[PDB]
Write a protein that binds this ligand. Structure first.
Ligand code: BCL
Ligand code: BCL
Ligand code: BPH
Ligand code: U10
Ligand code: 3PE
Ligand code: 3PE
Ligand code: 3PE
Ligand code: SPO
Ligand code: SPO
Ligand code: SPO
Ligand code: SPO
Ligand code: SPO
Ligand code: FE
Lengths: 53, 250, 44, 305, 275, 53, 44, 53, 44, 53, 44, 53, 44, 53
């Protein structure tokens, strides 16, 4: 409920910077897993769906 | 990108290597010009500007801020050396040695040359004098090796000039830097630890004669030493390595 | 007063509020994206 | 004559705990020990260390990577402490086989554990990089150390991250054994023709040799001018003494040009940094652009026939 | 053209052989007796390299190669087109390298400073002499020296390396590689630390040598110190040279199989021999 | 109990950092272990289930 | 009052209460996820 | 018995952190050792039990 | 120096008590887990 | 048997940590040597006793 | 009362006693374990 | 006869630690030597003796 | 009583006594073990 | 005769430690030499003597 007091413990600037870099790397990592798998590579799936688009 | 080439056999690999050569020429230019912040412009052998100055022009001025209220330093400074040098050329052409006009060790020329540094002590990170006698440091103690204090000191001719009475240490980097010698001549003397060998019976200084010990550059104070005094003392010993070598045995 | 950061108890109120707004925006967008992906190509 | 190779008499005062210039003191340990066998060569103080968030995280991730490599060794020894010790250098945690491509679906003992360990190794080196940056930032220093470390990290990441992705297979990354990664290096040269005919491998070697030669030269120079206040390199940058002058005149008279006290360290910085920077470029081009550096050299006129 | 502080150091003295006969400068370069000999040796070796190139079929400076005599000549002097040019260049190279070191000694004596630089360069010279003299003498043929060419001496490195299987499994080679890698790392860290102290963050005063002790103590827990880093770099590089020379000297003189089989002493220890 | 005394012993910042790090490590390792097994690899499981999905 | 951390006992009460609230939320979500995964593919 | 006095000798910070790390690493090792055995690999066992779950 | 750790007699009591309860909870959960695993697949 | 005087001399912290590390290593080595032996490997033994447990 | 650690005689006594209880527990459990293992699979 | 005085020469800590490490290493060496020899390897001896135990 | 270790005379005898007792116990147990092992599998 | 003078010249602690280490290394080396030779390996000799002990 009263989770706001984290800002009394951790510095907002550093937690925002770390959160941003963490989220970016996580997003890139998941997209690259999906492109790795030939069941979720969306470029090739779309190529086959429309018969080479 | 295998086998696919620009320009008819010019590759991404060819492109990369040519790109590197271009970058490296630029980096060599940068490195050479960075290394020209001391000693330029080139002079002629009479103190005037040289006719040739080299393919590389001088870099832009750069400033250092000095801690503990010791101003700023900008280089290249374009200034000429702030000491007179008692030499005289031995030939009207160029490229030949200049000969000392008096005592090379007392005048401070050749291997005995000193640079005109500031007459203030070098400081540690806290603003105190960096090199001091252990009577001042007072928390330093000998940790290993043999203490030279009390040992006789022997010149480059096998004659003893006095005894080690004190060590001067660097309080920042925990090191001994000078040995204070009490002389039978009648006074005191600092000897660089880099120029002394400590042995069981004595500290031997194989760069300076016993007659040279009578005239070692003095310090204003016996609790601190300026960078100018340091230059003069160390230069005196390093010059003795040439101008005292005939006093050695045999 | 406890402050490992020097901030005020109220200054944590405003920062927390705005951070929650940004958080909820990001998560709502991600939720809609996951709904769309799951319709388009379900993974469970 | 005293060669300043070993200290003659060691001295010690109060231990030095560091400069305070914006460092969080509560993250700096307080205990120093003074070890005189090191004081013959260098400093005797085994000083405090700084331990903050980045260092703790980096150590945790790296230690876990190390642990996971060890556990794989134990398992492939068929639990034997004797084989484990006999094969401590010959065993490796190997990447997945080629048939798994870049997918994350390979059996745990056939590349999966390699992937997990590799992820945590990646995390720790990047956190250590951030540490090298932030320790400089907290003292108010320039960022040269972090940039130099970034160059070495670039070679590391082309070795196992960038190039295997561009080749489409984890199977081309380097395994985690002492002898197997040397085997990997040998195999890599053997499969790409001959890596001697890789121009960036040649340039990397030139910078390795040059950095070794340069620091022979620079250490010998500083030691030779130690009779003067030579090794106090800082404060000779801002107040030139005879040590800097004589060091410059030695090399000017010897080879016709010289450096300055500040600028010799730029040469060394660039020679050291250019070794992994140029090396990574040459590995990245291998397989991706050039398959056989021998025939490429023949076509580009530096291998005969 | 003298540097603005150079004049006071241009004094007579410091020579080893010929007194004031050669005690003069040519531009920047000090000459001395060994400057005369080093110039002559270097010029003659370069000029025999060019003459040997002329006898081949390429002027491409990356395909020119002067080859040692065939093994059938043993340690004899070969006909000049059948390995003799290589021997002449090798003798010229030794003469110039040794003369260069002796010239360095004279410059150190004139600027009264230690002799560490010629000493270190002599370690480099010893690695070279091991490569072209000591090892081929023990093997009984000059033809075990390496051919002189920008990319053909790499063919020598390749052939000799693969004679003993994978050369990585050579314990002295391992030690030498570690010393080369470590000296490069140390150069990187030392240059970086000096530059960081001299070039702070914008607007800050220049850092002290205390700050750089503090930087390494914070980063790794230890600081070797200003004097210590130079001693360390010097000895690292010298050991890399020496252990590389020992690496190559052992191969073909006292060890002859694939270097991988050397570790069979550990792998065949009787308790785990059969496992 | 009255476990709160733990915060009297350890600084909360170090505890939170360590605990987040270990949770992240644990989650990454479990997910990668499941992906490595071809009975719990959900991407490939879905690919088989939905006839290429 | 003893303070290795500089925390007073009343600050420890609140900090512990909030920590427990967060931990319980995390565990409850993980429990729901495990029930769902067990229904989807049971592993015992 | 009266083990409590050990906390007057050993620092609770060091002991607690070391025990936490050791227990975590021990548990990871045991689970990985069990997964390596193809008689206690519970993921594969469940795969067999339910005919590919 | 009786107190190598800055703890006193009574706060050493309280720390030991909470530590011992935590240890007991860990061990009891482990015992139940081992009973369940032994029923599921006995290793002895 | 008044051996308590050893505690007058030896640091209890140092000796306790050394004993603990040594005992853990000893137990691990003995267990691993048992698992290595296909006559005392209890995972594979139980597999045969219960017909693949 | 000479002591390389500074612990007095009496803390040595109580520390030794608690050390003995711990040691006897460890050995007695190990004895029971070895008996059980020897029954299960004798080794000599 | 009166060998006790040696505790005035040798520091008891160094002697006791060196001797303990000494005896441990010697015992480990002898056990490993017996295990190395397949005539005193008691695990395989028992396996043969009790028909694979 | 010159002493490098710093212990006076009284520690020497009791230290030696307890040391000798532990020594004799160790060898006695080792002797019993060797007799048992020799009976089990003679090596001489 | 009067050899005890050496104990005024060489420190008993260093000399005794070196002597102990040296004698142990010598005895170990001689025993391993004997065990290496298949003529004086007493374990194998006992094995042959009692028909596999
Ligand atoms: C048969 C073998 C092949 C061969 C195959 C290869 C291959 C393959 C590679 C090289 C590479 C290199 N080769 Mg080779 N090479 C051969 C012959 C040679 C010879 C010789 C005399 O014959 C020489 C001198 C060299 C020299 C070199 C180097 C110049 C270069 C590596 C540069 C570098 O920075 O490395 C040292 C730096 C690193 C390895 C970077 C990574 C280190 C990281 C940063 C460490 C971080 C910390 C770590 C994670 C954890 C532990 C720390 C904890 C404290 C415990 N090669 C022959 C032809 N060579 C590399 C290169 O760049 O090629 C172009 C490379 O990948
Ligand atoms: C198939 C190839 C084999 C192999 C086979 C060999 C062989 C064979 C040898 C080495 C040697 C070495 N190898 Mg190996 N090596 C391999 C892979 C590697 C790898 C790697 C990452 O894979 C690395 C890092 C190394 C590293 C090294 C070094 C330890 C060493 C080279 C340094 C040296 O000798 O300096 C010594 C420096 C010199 C000889 C330079 C001397 C310079 C002189 C004094 C001055 C010259 C001036 C010049 C003419 C002036 C021009 C004028 C201009 C004005 C400038 N090898 C593989 C496995 N390696 C060599 C060695 O140890 O040699 C001693 C060697 O012989
Ligand atoms: C310019 C290029 C050169 C260079 C540069 C360079 N490297 C650098 C730097 C720079 C400028 C740094 O700032 C950085 C540094 O901090 O140096 C002191 C670093 C450094 N370069 C290093 C190594 C290194 N550099 C190499 C190379 C080079 N680095 C190049 C030649 C190599 C080679 C040649 O292979 C190596 C091996 C490190 C000393 C350091 C980076 C520190 C680092 O990466 O930390 C990450 C941490 C880990 C992986 C954690 C490991 C933890 C231990 C294994 C724990 C042990 C615990 C216990 C024993 C038990 C364990 C198991 C389980 C039970 C836990
Ligand atoms: C703190 O100190 C330091 C400096 O200084 C302040 C420095 O400068 C340097 C020196 C290092 C640098 C300047 C960095 C760059 C150096 C390198 C990258 C090393 C590689 C250099 C080369 C490529 C060598 C080329 C130079 C040569 C070999 C000169 C060639 C000259 C001749 C062959 C002929 C010489 C002329 C003579 C003898 C005239 C004879 C006359 C007759 C008539 C006979 C160091 C190490 C140093 O640490
Ligand atoms: C027969 C063929 C002859 C050549 C073929 C040999 C191979 C050459 C390859 C390396 C080049 C080495 C040649 C070095 C030249 C030496 C002469 C010299 O440098 O002195 C002349 C010049 C004048 O000095 P100065 O007046 O003080 O300059 C400042 C004033 N404006 O001083 C200067 O120019 C100052 C500038 C310094 C030059 C920087 C040196 C760069 C070396 C880095 C190389 C490392 C990478 C090499 C890669 C090798 C790959 C194979
Ligand atoms: C066809 C196109 C081909 C390319 C040709 C064009 C290239 C032109 C670029 C100029 C050439 C180099 C000459 C100038 C660069 C030298 C650096 C410099 O100018 O000064 C150094 C400067 C820092 O200034 P400083 O006084 O030291 O103060 C900083 C205080 N913190 O700044 C620096 O210190 C630079 C520090 C960063 C340098 C690199 C660090 C490496 C980091 C990781 C490298 C990994 C990336 C690998 C890239 C490979 C891509 C395939
Ligand atoms: C060879 C035939 C020519 C030499 C015969 C005569 C030599 C006489 C001795 C000598 O060299 O004189 C020293 C010469 C002139 O310097 P002096 O110092 O002028 O007074 C300075 C006044 N400004 O000192 C010098 O300044 C010499 C340098 C003059 C400018 C040289 C320009 C570069 C030199 C050629 C380019 C580099 C190539 C070198 C060899 C490459 C081989 C691959
Ligand atoms: C297959 O094996 C092959 C390896 C046979 C060959 C092996 C040969 C071997 C292994 C020879 C081994 C000989 C040895 C060294 C035997 C062991 C000697 C020792 C040191 C035994 C010690 C036993 C137990 C002790 C000291 C008690 C442990 C448990 C306790 C609870 C008391 C101390 C610890 C704690 C945690 C309590 C006090 C501390 C606190 C903080 C309350
Ligand atoms: C994927 O790779 C591999 C295959 C390695 C294996 C692992 C797979 C998995 C599942 C790994 C685990 C992934 C994790 C850690 C999932 C958990 C993710 C979390 C915790 C996501 C949280 C996201 C975002 C939060 C909590 C908040 C976001 C807030 C914003 C975006 C708003 C920020 C902007 C603001 C506040 C504007 C105002 C700014 C100022 C300075 C006032
Ligand atoms: C089979 O393979 C096995 C190998 C998978 C791999 C691993 C096996 C193992 C070892 C598994 C078990 C590992 C352990 C030890 C798990 C225990 C996990 C714990 C302790 C989870 C507890 C989490 C508690 C959290 C995350 C606390 C809070 C949650 C929040 C979202 C933060 C809220 C807290 C606040 C806001 C307090 C901040 C303070 C103020 C004043 C606001
Ligand atoms: C008693 O306890 C233990 C079990 C300690 C016994 C331990 C034994 C040990 C620790 C043995 C460890 C041995 C060795 C040989 C360690 C060193 C191995 C070597 C030679 C490592 C060299 C590696 C070179 C490179 C280039 C490594 C990594 C490069 C990267 C770019 C890492 C990132 C790569 C990937 C694929 C990250 C993956 C990310 C995802 C999301 C899958
Ligand atoms: C199964 O696969 C392979 C694994 C077959 C076989 C492996 C065989 C091996 C390696 C066997 C032997 C393993 C060994 C040597 C195990 C030793 C285990 C030990 C030493 C266990 C001892 C544990 C001691 C304690 C005190 C454990 C837990 C105590 C706590 C968790 C205290 C909790 C209280 C705290 C954290 C205070 C605050 C309270 C809370 C609730 C946070
Ligand atoms: Fe330097």
């Amino acid at each position: 409920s009263k989770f706001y007091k984290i800002w009394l413990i951790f510095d907002p600037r550093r937690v925002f910077v770390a959160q941003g870099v963490f989220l970016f790397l996580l997003a890139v990592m998941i997209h690259l897993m999906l492109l790795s798998n030939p069941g979720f590579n969306w470029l090739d799936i779309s190529g086959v769906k429309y018969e080479r688009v | 990108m295998v086998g696919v080439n620009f320009f008819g056999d010019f590759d991404l690999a060819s492109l990369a290597i040519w790109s590197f050569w271009l970058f490296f020429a630029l980096l060599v230019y940068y490195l050479q010009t960075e290394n020209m912040r001391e000693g330029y412009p080139l002079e002629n052998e009479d103190g005037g500007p040289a006719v040739n100055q080299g393919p590389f022009p001088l870099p832009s001025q750069k400033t250092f801020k000095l801690p503990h209220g010791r101003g700023e330093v900008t280089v290249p400074d374009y200034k000429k050396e702030a000491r007179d040098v008692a030499l005289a050329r031995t030939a009207v052409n160029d490229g030949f040695p200049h000969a000392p006009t008096g005592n090379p060790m007392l005048d401070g020329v050749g291997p005995a040359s000193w640079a005109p540094r500031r007459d203030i002590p070098e400081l540690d990170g806290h603003g105190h004098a960096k090199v001091v006698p252990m009577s001042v440091a007072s928390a330093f103690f000998v940790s290993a090796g043999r203490d030279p204090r009390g040992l006789p000191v022997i010149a480059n001719d096998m004659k003893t000039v006095g005894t080690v009475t004190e060590m001067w240490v660097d309080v920042a980097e925990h090191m001994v830097r000078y040995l204070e010698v009490d002389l039978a001549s009648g006074g005191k003397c600092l000897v660089p630890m880099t120029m002394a060998i400590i042995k069981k019976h004595a500290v031997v200084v194989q760069s300076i004669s016993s007659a040279a010990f009578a005239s070692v550059p003095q310090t204003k104070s016996m609790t601190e030493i300026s960078m100018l005094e340091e230059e003069k003392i160390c230069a005196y010993f390093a010059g003795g390595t040439m101008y005292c070598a005939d006093a050695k045995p045999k | 007063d406890l402050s490992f950061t020097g901030l005020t108890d109220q200054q944590a109120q405003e920062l927390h509020s705005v951070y929650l707004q940004g958080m909820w925006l990001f998560i709502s967008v991600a939720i809609v994206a996951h709904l769309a992906v799951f319709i388009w190509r379900p993974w469970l | 004559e005293y060669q300043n190779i070993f200290t003659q008499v060691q001295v010690a005062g109060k231990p030095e705990l560091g400069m305070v210039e914006g460092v969080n003191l509560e993250n700096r340990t307080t205990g120093t020990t003074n070890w005189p066998i090191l004081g013959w060569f260098g400093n005797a103080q085994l000083g405090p260390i700084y331990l903050g968030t980045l260092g703790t995280m980096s150590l945790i991730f790296g230690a876990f990577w190390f642990f996971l490599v060890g556990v794989s060794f134990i398992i492939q020894a068929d639990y034997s402490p004797a084989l484990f010790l006999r094969e401590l250098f010959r065993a490796g945690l190997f990447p997945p086989a080629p048939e798994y491509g870049l997918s994350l679906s390979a059996p745990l003992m056939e590349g999966g554990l390699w992937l997990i360990a590799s992820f945590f190794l990646m995390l720790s080196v990047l956190l250590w990089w951030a540490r090298t940056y932030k320790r400089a930032a907290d003292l108010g220093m320039g960022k040269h150390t972090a940039w130099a470390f970034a160059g070495a990290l670039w070679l590391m990441f082309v070795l196992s991250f960038f190039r295997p992705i561009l080749m489409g297979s984890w199977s081309e990354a380097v395994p985690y054994g002492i002898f197997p990664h040397l085997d990997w290096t040998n195999n890599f040269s053997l499969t790409h023709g001959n890596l001697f005919y890789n121009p960036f491998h040649g340039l990397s070697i030139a910078f390795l040799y040059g950095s070794t030669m340069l620091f022979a030269m620079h250490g010998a120079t500083i030691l030779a001018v130690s009779r003067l206040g030579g090794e106090r390199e800082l404060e000779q940058i801002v107040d030139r003494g005879t040590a800097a002058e004589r060091a410059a005149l030695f090399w000017r008279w010897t080879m016709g040009f010289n450096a300055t006290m500040e600028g010799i360290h730029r040469w060394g910085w660039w020679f050291a940094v250019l070794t992994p920077v140029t090396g990574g470029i040459g590995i990245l081009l291998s397989g991706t652009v050039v398959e056989d550096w021998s025939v490429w050299a023949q076509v580009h006129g530096y291998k005969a026939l | 053209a003298l540097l603005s502080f150079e004049r006071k150091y241009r004094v007579p003295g410091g020579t080893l052989i010929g007194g004031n006969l050669f005690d003069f400068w040519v531009g920047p370069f000090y000459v001395g007796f060994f400057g005369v000999t080093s110039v002559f040796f270097a010029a003659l070796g370069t000029l025999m390299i060019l003459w040997g190139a002329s006898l081949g079929d390429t002027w491409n400076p990356l395909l020119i190669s002067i080859n040692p005599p065939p093994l059938e000549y043993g340690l004899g002097a070969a006909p000049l087109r059948e390995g003799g040019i290589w021997q002449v260049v090798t003798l010229c190279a030794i003469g110039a390298f040794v003369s260069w070191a002796m010239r360095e000694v004279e410059i150190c004596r004139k600027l009264g400073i230690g002799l560490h630089i010629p000493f270190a360069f002599s370690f480099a010279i010893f690695a070279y002499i091991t490569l072209v003299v000591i090892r081929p003498a023990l093997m009984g043929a000059w033809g075990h020296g390496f051919q002189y060419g920008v990319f053909t001496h790499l063919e020598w490195v390749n052939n000799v390396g693969y004679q003993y299987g994978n050369f990585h499994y050579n314990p002295l080679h391992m030690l030498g590689i570690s010393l080369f890698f470590t000296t490069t790392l140390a150069l990187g860290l030392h240059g970086a630390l000096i530059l960081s102290a001299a070039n702070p963050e914008t607007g800050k005063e220049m850092r002290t040598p205390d700050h750089e002790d503090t930087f390494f103590r914070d980063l790794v827990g230890y600081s070797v110190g200003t004097l210590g880093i130079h001693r360390l770099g010097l000895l690292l590089a010298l050991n890399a040279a020496f252990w590389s020379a020992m690496c190559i000297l052992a191969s073909g003189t006292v060890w002859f199989d694939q270097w991988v089989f050397w570790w069979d002493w550990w792998y065949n220890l009787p308790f785990w021999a059969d496992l």
